[PDB]
Amino acid sequence: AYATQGFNLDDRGRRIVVDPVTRIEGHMRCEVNVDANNVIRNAVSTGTMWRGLEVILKGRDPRDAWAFVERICGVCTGCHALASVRAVENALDIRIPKNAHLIREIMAKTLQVHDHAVHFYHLHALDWVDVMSALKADPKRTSELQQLVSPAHPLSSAGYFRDIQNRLKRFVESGQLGPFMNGYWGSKAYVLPPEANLMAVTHYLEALDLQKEWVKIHTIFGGKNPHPNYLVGGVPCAINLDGSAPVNMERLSFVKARIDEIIEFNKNVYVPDVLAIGTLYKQAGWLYGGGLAATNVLDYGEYPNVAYNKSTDQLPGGAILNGNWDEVFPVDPRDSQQVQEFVSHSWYKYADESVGLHPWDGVTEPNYVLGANTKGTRTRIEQIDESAKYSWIKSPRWRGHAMEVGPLSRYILAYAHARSGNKYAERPKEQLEYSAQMINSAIPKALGLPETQYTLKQLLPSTIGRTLARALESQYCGEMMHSDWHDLVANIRAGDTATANVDKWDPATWPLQAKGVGTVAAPRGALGHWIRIKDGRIENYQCVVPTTWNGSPRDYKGQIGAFEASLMNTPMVNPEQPVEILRTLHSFDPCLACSTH
């Protein structure tokens, strides 16, 4: 047992293993210890995969890098490509034209919406929604709930819900439950009434059909989704209004139509569902899962209104420590003393493992070895030994501090910035105050529940808060790319049709040595790619990815990362059913392929 960051770790209680953690991208093992009352007193995050992209990239052409690193992840598809072209452009002093900037922003915001909405419905919802309970729902009462939760959503009739319910009934009655097989249905950890379960499952099916439409924006500008194409120096989707070309006004009109559909979905389906589910779980008292969000949050800051001008970031970033929302520290990805990665408890080796390496000096040499207190063997692990190396995920820290990253972090940072006079953060602030009023007062009043008085400071550092922030961010991203589209069309019509700067396409024009960094506010948090170029080739290429931050194992000082902290202090209804573990872990939207790369 030991104390760290206000958490009292104790591994003397009952040990529980969850492997595989499902409804995530990639591979994770989670172990916890619970006390005599089934409260989690220890949590262990193990990334159970590695591919070695950083090693594979060595000696290759920086212009090809984006395609390799894009394949780090097909869920957050393209965000690694964006980071990569930004890193190379930074190294080579390439400024991309305005249309390429706007097209990249639109692609980034499209990914945000798609990733967030699919995550909530298809990965997260079953932690909050009991599908078997939806079968018992009354269609008329479901209709009435729908109209209170979201008046503007036109799919609300009692007959529509009856049809959906009947299809689910027949599906379950077959004895082939498919993705619902061996679920935790009926657990007391589920609190929604049948009608809310039916409404949510209906929206699950709605979202499954609609999500394929949103990505057609990627298809227009990048040829395909998943894995749209990017380009060092700009975008490949050349523009010609009067021509035959990749982009004309009809293609841009198509993009606009998809954006408008996105805005309706976020406003009418996604945000209201999360507010309603959040309210009901708040009413049940399930405010667990805050972890590091209550103290330390970080993002690099993203979406500048004016290209290459960070002061205009619409999701302004920085770092907060010790829960002090009155002081945002600037974060510099170039500073060797800020972002550093330890491997003390990871399956890698450094020359000196007592220190953290800035990614320009990063090292990735695998070292799969288990501690002496492991139960089992090297190829058949029963209980992992977290006193030694226990994960394929490195341990990123900021000036030695363990930080939570993600939409929640960005929304806390936005709120902090807006309080200190930053007008670029006005919209996220408005969203948060609106959400708090809905969760505390308006939704309870509508559903006949008592009103509460939680402040944002109390409400946001929680699994509910983390889930809320993701939905709000999706909404905000949809709104922003709507404006980006207008700016793009305006620029084109003003006579600027440029999509690529090719001045430094040829390696003969490059400095013989160079380094660069590209950052992105990816769906799951702070993403950075750091590159060293030598004689036209990749000398070093290091990625520090949002789930690397969140899912990290312990550092040299024994400090815990966001996943492990979030599970602490959480009661379990049944220690053999990982409902609460999944609910909180999923609120981070873990991408394990990303985390390990």
């Binding site: 595989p20 097989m181 499954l208 990505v215 990749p246 695998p366 090297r378």
Partner: protein
């Protein structure tokens, strides 16, 4: 009685799962609810840990020799297989176990078919395609990074309708989707034939949609349905959106030189 599908994940990026759920004809919703029984799939399944593991034995027993094994990703042979750990054991053990009683095996995408990005030089995990590990079962390769959504669901639809594996070429790919090179029906082919090429990004030629051969397009040596079926309900494909084909459906495409280096 819907055919059970046990969808395993090895080393992968999950782009193949994502592509599958983009299908418009048929809708993935309809595939899952009305066509197959998707009984194991990490991305979507309710159960985790021990409860998830228990599904495998149950389906394998009840539907012995009558379930489809779908594999996304691949097994690593280095690190004693523990660069991909499932249930505290190497993924390769899960793969071999589930494969033994499968009616058919689908290798989704370039990862399962050939190795894909993790198998590119120097392949630190010794990531290995499914057919080099499972050597005693019929395997259909559905390559691409990822494959087209309708190609993936098209394979499933054929298999469910006929209870047979579609006709395969010598590399194990379904002829119904991989018989044509991108270059055969590419809409830029008239430009290629007229010697009309892009030389630099966003030159006048690029703005008129000229052929991308000199920008590295690998369409002439790449077999896929991208020029005809196209992507995301026929919205576009790489070449239409202005980037050359990078050869993503072909074995070892990551190690055939820069994507921007032209074919000779």
């Amino acid at each position: 009685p819907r055919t059970p599908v046990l969808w395993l994940h090895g080393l992968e990026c999950t782009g193949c799962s994502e592509s599958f759920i983009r299908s418009a004809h048929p809708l993935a919703k309809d595939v899952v609810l009305s066509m197959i029984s998707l009984d194991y799939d990490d991305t979507l399944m309710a159960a985790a840990g021990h409860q998830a593991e228990a599904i495998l034995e149950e389906i394998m027993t009840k539907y012995k020799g009558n379930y489809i094994l779908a594999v996304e990703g691949n097994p690593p042979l280095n690190q004693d297989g523990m660069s991909c750990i499932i249930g505290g054991r190497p993924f390769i053990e899960q793969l071999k176990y589930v494969a033994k009683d499968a009616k058919a095996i689908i290798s989704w995408g370039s990862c399962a078919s050939w190795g894909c990005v993790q198998a590119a030089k120097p392949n630190p995990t010794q990531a290995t395609p499914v057919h080099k590990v499972i050597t005693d079962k019929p395997i259909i390769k559905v390559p691409g990074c990822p494959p087209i959504a309708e190609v993936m669901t098209g394979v499933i639809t054929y298999m469910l309708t006929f209870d047979r594996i579609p006709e395969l070429d010598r590399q194990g790919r379904p002829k119904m989707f991989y018989s044509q090179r991108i270059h055969d029906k590419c809409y830029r082919r008239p430009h290629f034939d007229a010697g009309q090429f892009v030389e630099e990004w966003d030159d006048e030629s690029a703005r008129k949609g000229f052929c991308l051969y000199k920008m590295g397009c690998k369409g002439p040596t790449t077999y896929n349905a991208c020029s005809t079926t196209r992507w995301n309900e026929g919205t576009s494909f790489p070449i239409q959106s202005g980037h050359g084909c990078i050869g993503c459906s072909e074995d070892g495409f990551w190690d055939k030189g820069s994507f921007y280096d032209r074919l000779t």
